[PDB]
Amino acid sequence: MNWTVDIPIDQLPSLPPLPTDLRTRLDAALAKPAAQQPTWPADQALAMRTVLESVPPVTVPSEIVRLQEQLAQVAKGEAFLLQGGDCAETFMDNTEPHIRGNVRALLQMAVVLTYGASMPVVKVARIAGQYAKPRSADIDALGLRSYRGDMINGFAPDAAAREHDPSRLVRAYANASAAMNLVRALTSSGLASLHLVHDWNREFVRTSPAGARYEALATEIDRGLRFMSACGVADRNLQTAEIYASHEALVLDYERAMLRLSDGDDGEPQLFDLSAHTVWIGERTRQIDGAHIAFAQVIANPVGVKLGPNMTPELAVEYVERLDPHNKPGRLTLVSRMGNHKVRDLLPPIVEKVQATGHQVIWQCDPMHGNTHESSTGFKTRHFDRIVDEVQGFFEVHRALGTHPGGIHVEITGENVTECLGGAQDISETDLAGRYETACDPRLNTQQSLELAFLVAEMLRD
Amino acid sequence: MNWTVDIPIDLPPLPTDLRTRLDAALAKPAAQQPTWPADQALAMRTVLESVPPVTVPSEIVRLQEQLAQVAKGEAFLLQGGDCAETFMDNTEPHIRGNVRALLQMAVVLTYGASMPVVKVARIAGQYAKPRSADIDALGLRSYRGDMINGFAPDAAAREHDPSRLVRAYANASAAMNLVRALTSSGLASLHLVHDWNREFVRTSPAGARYEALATEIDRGLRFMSACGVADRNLQTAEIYASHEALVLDYERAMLRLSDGDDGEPQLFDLSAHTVWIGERTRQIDGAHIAFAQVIANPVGVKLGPNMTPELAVEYVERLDPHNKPGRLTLVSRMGNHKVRDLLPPIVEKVQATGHQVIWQCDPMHGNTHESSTGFKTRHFDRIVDEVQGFFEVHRALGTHPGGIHVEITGENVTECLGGAQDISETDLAGRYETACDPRLNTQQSLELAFLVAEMLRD
Amino acid sequence: MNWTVDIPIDQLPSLPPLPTDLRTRLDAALAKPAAQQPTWPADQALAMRTVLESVPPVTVPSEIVRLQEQLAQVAKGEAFLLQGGDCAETFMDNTEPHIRGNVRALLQMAVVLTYGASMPVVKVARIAGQYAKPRSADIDALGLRSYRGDMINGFAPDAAAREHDPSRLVRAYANASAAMNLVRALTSSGLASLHLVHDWNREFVRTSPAGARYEALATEIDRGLRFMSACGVADRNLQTAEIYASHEALVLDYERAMLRLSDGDDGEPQLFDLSAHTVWIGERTRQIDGAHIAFAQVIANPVGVKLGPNMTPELAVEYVERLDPHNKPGRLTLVSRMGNHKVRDLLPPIVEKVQATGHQVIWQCDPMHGNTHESSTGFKTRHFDRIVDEVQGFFEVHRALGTHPGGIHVEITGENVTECLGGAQDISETDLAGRYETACDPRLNTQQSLELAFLVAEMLRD
Amino acid sequence: MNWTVDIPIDLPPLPTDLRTRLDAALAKPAAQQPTWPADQALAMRTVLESVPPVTVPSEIVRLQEQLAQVAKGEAFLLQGGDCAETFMDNTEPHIRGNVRALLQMAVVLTYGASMPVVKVARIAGQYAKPRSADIDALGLRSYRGDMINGFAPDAAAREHDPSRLVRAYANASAAMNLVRALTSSGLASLHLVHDWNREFVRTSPAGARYEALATEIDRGLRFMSACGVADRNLQTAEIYASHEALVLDYERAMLRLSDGDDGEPQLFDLSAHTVWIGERTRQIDGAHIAFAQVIANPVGVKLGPNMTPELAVEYVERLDPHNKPGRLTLVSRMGNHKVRDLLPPIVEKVQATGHQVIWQCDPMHGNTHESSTGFKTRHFDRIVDEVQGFFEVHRALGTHPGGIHVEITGENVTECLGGAQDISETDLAGRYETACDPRLNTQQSLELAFLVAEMLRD
Ligand SMILES: N[C@H](Cc1ccccc1)C(=O)O
Ligand SMILES: N[C@H](Cc1ccccc1)C(=O)O
Ligand SMILES: N[C@H](Cc1ccccc1)C(=O)O
Ligand SMILES: N[C@H](Cc1ccccc1)C(=O)O
Ligand SMILES: [Cl-]
Ligand SMILES: [Cl-]
Ligand SMILES: [Cl-]
Ligand SMILES: [Cl-]
Ligand SMILES: [Cl-]
Ligand SMILES: [Cl-]
Ligand SMILES: [Cl-]
Ligand SMILES: [Cl-]
Ligand SMILES: [Cl-]
Ligand SMILES: [Cl-]
Ligand SMILES: [Mn+2]
Ligand SMILES: [Mn+2]
Ligand SMILES: [Mn+2]
Ligand SMILES: [Mn+2]
């Protein structure tokens, strides 16, 4: 009568434990205080962690070392990073059509951005694990315990669903592994075929109210593709498209149980977080002496740190020295989210000070999380013009300083939602009640995200 | 303890004929099904109708083309893995081992056959088995694989539990993710795979017998490299997923309808790339055969010693009505003592129909006996001999010995007798770990690939 | 004291003769009257032919069957033919720098045209054998026997040099084979590298007086190339560029001694003319019952026929039926040279009548040979605007009829000559005396030819 | 009769140092040169300064990189063709045969070596030879190859004629055009080339001895194909042109200056890709060695039984002053009876210098004798044995046996004694067609490739 099915888990034999030396390092790191963690009992968390220690990984080390090399190129100014997907993934919407939509939107943006940048685009999805979020307050407008993502509790507004349930750590892995199996399948079959992808852009150009504005660039791209074909370059020549998985490393019970030690065939064994390919640390959990930063020191994965308007140049240097102690280009990404009214003033000093350290970080724009406001109709929202403008300001800072505008980080979807105001749709406050489906922040819908890619490409062409 | 899934309180409807044909198939009698309550099965089916598929249609169409080459005599099929996967052993080391053993056998067979080898694993779903008796030798309700019931000999664990339909998908999907990750990784690199054959040659008691062929293979690989062919030039290694389509509650919930980018909409079973129908579930007017008629996936049918040439024609005509080479595989499982006498007349009739099926040898399931120590077992020499007889039948008739279907593992278990290890009946109790039939261990499967390669060379 | 060296030839053992059946066919064909042939003695011609029967061929059959397949695509509307080079090759200018220049110009035009057409361009050079020309009158303005090309006599204005010398048949082969060895070498090494070729177009855009007009398309092409690179397509992926050799089959003594019989490994043996890959028959030698047309019936090579303003639709059908009796697309090319003032009127009926036959010919524009006039400064010349305009009219005829404008045939050079009037240079009648170096017709210089390619590409884009 | 070329009554000037170094090299004494008048040589040189080159610089830089791999022990060099090309036999069938034999030997050697084979033909220029006596056994002025004089034994034909400088370029250029055409054609297709080995195995008297290796090679090729590697995947077959740089009037007129797209301007001899300096022209302060110092081409030096370890070091230091691996090849030609004793100490000293040269065996030129029937000849067993001794020296020292340099033809001549054909002294008069030294025929060269492949396998 709860409309729910229960899946038993047996406490099955664990694989040989992690080596004692790394466990000691790891235990030292997680002794530090950890903001934003779930409040579930510890014996129960341990039981779920023991299950996760034994499951097949979501990613494998060799894919992560591959990503590291591709991101190294981004840091050196010869590549561009595209990172995008849902603000919050839900288990109920973790379906083939939704997954296919988001993959498709990301591929569409990537080809437009590749042409604009005239250099390779690394495609990183917010997918297969983006199931946890922080909150500012512990009581929401409905008087309930806050929703903190499907890894922690349920979205539905009732007390039973909002209690912190550690079994969701395993339900999270099941959904993540299944989502990733599908991403891998899609990217290695027709969906990622270049000539198929631009034909979607041709449907966008015909059915956009501002399609006449983007016709020139769309046509230009189409002729670049036919040029390749005409020069005797076929699909299988290009090779399969690669879409990496990422999420905010927020719930340490999950991330630590997904840790694995590498083969040692490559050379030296090391701890990888195999819940994803890359992870980032959020604005509310980046305490310099906190457990999240310390966790990121111990793992080999490429990492990111969100930098909001309170950031100082000095604190940014500390992040560079702690998270890139061996000076590996593209190991650390700094993700500026300042707001379009503040980025032109606040970012330059941070960039200058970090460049002076001699490290090579990736400068990445998040034009979303600095530009959120509430509408008069009641829906939390963002304006497309303000999103565009911060990317514009981001690029101007780098063009002025002679540094690399290394990528973008956006919240998008392949669904035709009504969540962000503006775009060629020119969506209104009234329109938001039509299809407002996000479980957290508002996303660019399929048309808007494409429109944004076209605009960021023109910024790459200047 | 438990994790919990929300049934969707809440997908555009099937074309009318497919709905009609699907209902008609599943209305027919079905052997070997679980006995759990319908309202619970329905709830599980509704969850599985919403999950991301294990495979996609374009992969199955691709498999269909590659299998067509096998049917035509221009490729060879290698199918292998656990007799029964367990949720307990669905781990990275176990999956990686089985993937590795298959890749190793494959390269040896490629070289011996002088033609491409299609690699199909029994994996990411092989969670159900049929039984002859519903009461086992301990007086318990029989184990029928982790989809239906638990391996442990306890009444409570043997109860049929429909929540295992969803746990089985969770494990299948997680396993397939890893298979895809590994196969795009180095693990599938030709040069890496050959270096495992060197380890085997050095640490086998019969290594000296397989050295000449191993050295010849190694030189074949270095020749490619010297002619200017690098890893990245090669097409990425492809390992397809298969299992027996046994539990119809599972297979029907994993059905999806294709797009119209390539022809008319069709039903694909996306729990796997290819499935087969077993000896006990193969009734000509039963639900399993009829389900196979409605799905677009390539299929196989197991054929034992009671098979007639006439029944075989009927299977081909029902399951390959449009004469699509490689859509149907006939899986011969006769026993080494009977295959030479029983297979030829079946092959002759089927060839005369004009259809192009893949003839595949299963040398395992016709050669089981019980040891004096108490473990059910197979002798390595009997396994080799059925494949040998299978090859002779096809050489004599001039037809294509199209492939093998074997139960193997990448661990050094002690389940099948013999091989260069000369495993005795006493040795079986050391590492007998299978949840059902005895598998060739890592050395024995490798030994078999070498021996079958020589059969391909003659 | 004649400033000349004599190279002995020994009458060395001939290879086994051609088979008797083909020789009988061939003898029947060459019994027909042959316009424009040299007047040298027959015993002497025989001696040189016997030498040529024994030499290594300029081309090989498998290359010609390859060309046939590529031209088949042109005829079916999925490819474009570029044919170009000197009006008349001279032995004295058959040098590495001159050869490299012409190859380079052709490659430059090809990449611009490939992008414009969005389909593959077959590159055929007028090279390695274009050493013979017809004449209208037998006495030139200087009162001497006419120059008829280096295969026949010398350009210098003196009686000794103008006598018809059959040893030039062998000197012609020596130069042809040597030129081709170099073309093969250049095309299989860096010169034909796509990314190298467009950088020359970047030097053209900067140093053309009309460079600002062609900047947009040049930039667009450059971004198409970087797109390929960014998608992970390297040089060796594309494969080596192919440049085929062609000339007017005019001197039958030469063409018939260069005939060879194919291996028979492909299937059926057949006569190929191995002096070139493809040859064409000129306006003054295309007598329907003449030896040139009959010769073209017997060889397996792809052929062309020049169609001037006197052409009728009926006579064009006869050419199609005689030269394409087995209906092989791209085996026959019809080369319209009408003049820009006449093409829009005269070509349409010819096209309609030939389409009605059911054959698939290649429609090729020669905008040069219909637009020649004499300047007030004394130099035979052509105006760039009139050349451009006939290609324009050619395209309009095909766009109107729904048929394929299959290619162009031009006389160009990689030298900065002053021979054709106009272009962005806007060369004048006065300017012609600067660098007028052609041994026959005026050629588009390096800048003009490129300018023409840019203009024909825009015609392909509409 | 004759064709006639216009000397150009009428090229931007060489950098001052290159001019200086070139003049200084050619001012030194030069052995074995033709004795024709200077004003006529100058006129011929002026014509050749204007012709399209036989090779281009980027091909030579490419050859230099591939030869570097040989020097490092990661590739093998095959060099072969006519002892002396003739203008009379410079025909399509003769060129195609020699190209074919080289491609055939190459694939066998690739498989035996398990590493890439650089293919260098003696072709498109091998028109000059040295002589010990200026009067031959008939009392005529000696034949010195078609560049200088005619083969026929007539005083008039033996006169040194400088017009042969231009006739030699004409033939060289025409031959190279065809080589390039053939190598981009099917003729260079791996699968085609192996089918010629099958013909050889069936129609050799010793075919049964080479069948196992032939079958193994065939299976190596089918393995590539089965792993999804097609012709078009492979890099196009490359055959480089070489000859002895003997006639300095020829080589100097064929010099061209490079561009600055890759470093400083340099002189390339574009009559070939690589050239070598012979035993009789190898004087340390002579014009040939000094000419070799000024050109960018990879070079070789022939080393006979009088060679010292010390003189060898001097050649390496003069010819590889910048320590560029594979820029220099040392070509051992000792005699099968002497190579085991005479080569080791030379190899030891040269290795100690720190330079990386290619050690190449010439098993031909140390093993000539005169038969009782009157034809100069070599025995197949002696040729094989020098290569065998050459391999032993390098195995014992742990150095790289880098290649072979042989005189072969794609026609079945009767010039060298022995082989599976067991050609006798009586048989020599059947088809003795060489214009100088006896060449291994089409069967014998192939037989040698097989035998050298086994030496590479041990
Ligand atoms: N949509 C998934 C169903 C699912 C079950 C098991 C694994 C993966 C997904 C959920 O509701 O949690
Ligand atoms: N061995 C698996 C662990 C697992 C849990 C959830 C999903 C997938 C796998 C099980 O006990 O079910
Ligand atoms: N430029 C050539 C020289 C040449 C000679 C021989 C062969 C090819 C070219 C000529 O004057 O005829
Ligand atoms: N065999 C050649 C024929 C030849 C002539 C001219 C150029 C090239 C080759 C000769 O007698 O010189
Ligand atoms: Cl907190
Ligand atoms: Cl890995
Ligand atoms: Cl709230
Ligand atoms: Cl039953
Ligand atoms: Cl699909
Ligand atoms: Cl006339
Ligand atoms: Cl050919
Ligand atoms: Cl005149
Ligand atoms: Cl001398
Ligand atoms: Cl070059
Ligand atoms: Mn968000
Ligand atoms: Mn079994
Ligand atoms: Mn002309
Ligand atoms: Mn010799």
Author numbering:
A (entry chain A), C (entry chain A): 1 to 462
B (entry chain B), D (entry chain B): 1 to 10, 15 to 462
What did the authors write?
The enzyme 3-deoxy-d-arabino-heptulosonate 7-phosphate synthase (DAH7PS) catalyzes the first committed step of the shikimate pathway, which is the aldol-like condensation of phosphoenolpyruvate (PEP) and erythrose 4-phosphate (E4P) to produce 3-deoxy-d-arabino-heptulosonate 7-phosphate (DAH7P). Previous studies revealed a sophisticated synergistic allosteric regulation of DAH7PS from Mycobacterium tuberculosis (MtuDAH7PS) by binary or ternary combinations of the three aromatic amino acids, Phe, Tyr and Trp. The crystal structure of MtuDAH7PS revealed that the quaternary structure of this enzyme is a homotetramer of (β/α)8 TIM barrel subunits. Crystal structures of MtuDAH7PS in complex with different combinations of aromatic amino acids revealed three distinctive allosteric binding sites located at the dimer and tetramer interfaces of the enzyme, formed by accessory elements to the basic barrel.
The binding modes of all three aromatic d-amino acids in the Phe site are very similar to the binding modes of the respective l-enantiomers. The configuration of the ligand does not appear to significantly influence the conformation of the MtuDAH7PS residues that form the Phe binding site. For all aromatic d-amino acids, the amino and carboxy moieties project into the same binding pockets as the respective moieties of the l-amino acids. d-Phe binds to the Phe site in a very similar binding mode as the l-enantiomer, the root mean square deviation (RMSD) between the position of d-Phe and l-Phe ligands is 1.46 Å. The phenyl side chain of d-Phe is slightly tilted in the hydrophobic pocket when compared to the binding mode of l-Phe. However, high atomic displacement factors and poor electron density for the N-terminal region in the d-Trp bound structure suggest that flexibility of this region might be increased upon ligand binding. The only major difference in binding mode when comparing aromatic amino acids of l-configuration with their respective d-enantiomers is the lack of a hydrogen bonding interaction between the amino moiety of the d-configured ligands and the sidechain carbonyl of Asn175 on MtuDAH7PS (highlighted in red in Fig 4). The distance of the amino group of the ligand to the side-chain carbonyl group of Asn175 increases from 2.8 Å to 3.6 Å (l-Phe versus d-Phe), 2.6 Å to 3.7 Å (l-Trp versus d-Trp) and 2.7 Å to 3.6 Å (l-Tyr versus d-Tyr), respectively. The only significant difference between the binding mode of l-Phe and d-Phe in site 1 is the lack of a hydrogen bond between d-Phe and the Asn175 side-chain carbonyl. This may indicate that the ligand in site 1 needs to establish a contact to Asn175 in order for transmission of a signal from site 1 to either site 2 or the active site to occur. The affinity of d-Phe to the enzyme is only slightly lower when compared with the natural enantiomer: the dissociation constant (Kd) of d-Phe from MtuDAH7PS was determined as 93 ± 5 μM.
